[PDB]
């Protein structure tokens, strides 16, 4: 069959959130209060495209 199409390693470069899980869980309620709109754009794009290659931006 066909060839799978993957993004380059340059397209997977981003400044990661290099904190621990207790740092995230401590900040999680204000993170859900404040970072609402890009998170829900991403999860809508993620449940609609059903493909993590269409959701990288």
């Amino acid at each position: 069959p066909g060839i799978v199409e993957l993004p380059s390693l340059e397209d997977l470069k981003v400044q990661e959130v290099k904190v621990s899980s207790s740092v995230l869980k401590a900040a999680a309620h204000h993170y859900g209060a404040q970072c609402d709109k890009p998170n829900k754009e991403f999860m809508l794009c993620r449940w609609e495209e059903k493909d993590p290659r269409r959701c990288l931006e």
């Binding site: 999860m43 993620r46 449940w47 059903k50 493909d51 993590p52």
Partner: protein, 63 residues
């Protein structure tokens, strides 16, 4: 009975039986084609009802 009665009654008998014979040969041909191709109302062995499929957003998106 008259020869008229026996004659025309024989013609009615021969019509009915020739028509039943043609319908039997057509019934065999219809059965052969419907078992071979599978596009008639017969030999419709069941598949899975697609009303059973859940179309909700699941726990993970990739599905």
């Amino acid at each position: 009975d008259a020869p008229e009665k026996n004659y025309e009654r024989t013609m009615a008998i021969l019509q009915i039986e020739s028509e039943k014979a043609e319908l039997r040969l057509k019934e065999l041909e219809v059965r052969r084609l419907m078992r071979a191709k599978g596009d008639g109302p017969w030999f419709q062995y069941p598949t899975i009802d697609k009303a059973l499929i859940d179309h909700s957003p699941k726990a993970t998106p990739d599905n």
